[PDB]
Amino acid sequence: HGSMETPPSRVYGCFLEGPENPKSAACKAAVAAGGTQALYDWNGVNQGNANGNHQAVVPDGQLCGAGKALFKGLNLARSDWPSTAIAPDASGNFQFVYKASAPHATRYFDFYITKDGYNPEKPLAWSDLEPAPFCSITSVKLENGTYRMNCPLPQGKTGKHVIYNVWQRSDSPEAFYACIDVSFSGAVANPWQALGNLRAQQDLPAGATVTLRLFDAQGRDAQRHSLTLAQGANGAKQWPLALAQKVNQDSTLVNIGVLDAYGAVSPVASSQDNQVYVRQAGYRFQVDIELPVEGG
Ligand SMILES: [N+]
Ligand SMILES: [N+]
Ligand SMILES: [N+]
Structure with a gap:
């Protein structure tokens, strides 16, 4: 055993x-x-x-x-x-x-x-x-x-x-x-490169959906990852981590969190300290926000 x-x-x-x-x-x-x-x-x-x-x-x-x-x-x-x-x-x-x-x-x-x-x-x-x-x-x-x-x-x-x-x-x-x-490790250096900061201005309403789009060096759609925020995940120091967890789970092309000495990216319960990394150059990402539909 x-x-x-x-x-x-x-x-x-x-x-x-x-x-x-x-x-x-x-x-x-x-x-x-x-x-x-x-x-x-x-x-x-x-x-x-x-x-x-x-x-x-x-x-x-x-x-x-x-x-x-x-x-x-x-x-x-x-x-x-x-x-x-x-x-x-x-x-x-x-x-x-x-x-x-x-x-x-x-x-x-x-x-x-x-x-x-x-x-x-x-x-x-x-x-x-x-x-x-x-x-x-x-x-x-x-x-x-x-x-x-x-x-x-x-x-x-x-x-x-x-x-x-x-x-x-x-x-x-x-x-x-x-x-x-x-x-x-590949035959070519593949160090995680930071693109932006997954920053949160204020809190989001529970039930709103948060989407992260990723674009390659040619502006093409590379990946998409969406997450509807249950109560307790809509906090401003909460949702950037909630999204960074859904991203890391479904993808190895982009990772959101903190880089450590070894080379791993683990998120944090931070409003601003979460970062978007990709192993190539020239990539860009956008964060879109669907708000809960209103009307009867
Ligand atoms: N055994
Ligand atoms: N193979
Ligand atoms: N999943």
């Missing part, structure tokens, strides 16, 4: 946050979806009778949850799942650190990687992953409750990806699954 800690699997992550008080939107939406109980049984994302035929026992659309109704909340298709940014060493490899709360005999440690062009918003299916694993570990030694394996990192990848780790025990027929959300 266990999962990856370096990098953190999607389940280890949500849990290091604090199941009883999630911090990231994805994790909040995960506990609201499948309960807090799954986040504690974080070691049992498994299939007792895989026998090496994971493709026949893990249903499409529930890979992150091994089709276990308990972990239903892990299969959410979102663009904001917290993710580790990874890169190779001087030789192109990556040292994975798997945490085994119960060291059992090992058959293999297979690493799958989403195809080029993976779309976070489509629930992870087997065919969204590349056909054969990019790294196959066949013997390990324990070291302070973790299995450490050097792996050749796939080259040419770019953007947010999911590494799918399968651990097939040798002593029994069961295996464990780990959706690791990673993020690759």
Whole structure:
């Protein structure tokens, strides 16, 4: 039993946050979806009778949850799942650190990687992953409750990806699954660039709708994201964050919030401090406001 800690699997992550008080939107939406109980049984994302035929026992659309109704909340298709940014060493490899709360005999440690062009918003299916694993570990030694394996990192990848780790025990027929959300650096520097400030002059009436349009370098419609503000989200120090959360969730092309040293953009409960970032130049954005229809 266990999962990856370096990098953190999607389940280890949500849990290091604090199941009883999630911090990231994805994790909040995960506990609201499948309960807090799954986040504690974080070691049992498994299939007792895989026998090496994971493709026949893990249903499409529930890979992150091994089709276990308990972990239903892990299969959410979102663009904001917290993710580790990874890169190779001087030789192109990556040292994975798997945490085994119960060291059992090992058959293999297979690493799958989403195809080029993976779309976070489509629930992870087997065919969204590349056909054969990019790294196959066949013997390990324990070291302070973790299995450490050097792996050749796939080259040419770019953007947010999911590494799918399968651990097939040798002593029994069961295996464990780990959706690791990673993020690759392209062949060209892709630093988040700020475009404007998602500023709020005064509060908006409850039920009004707030729309953010994004235009590319050629003034073409790039993306659109709308959000009707329920009571309590219409505050001036509230709605800019409410919109910045709907944006980050549905999109990886534009992110609204605060940039940190690592390179991540997380919003804030601020009236002015929320910023609109895009990984290309010359982009522009507009904020439109539909007011609640009046009349009988
Ligand atoms: N077990
Ligand atoms: N691919
Ligand atoms: N959504």
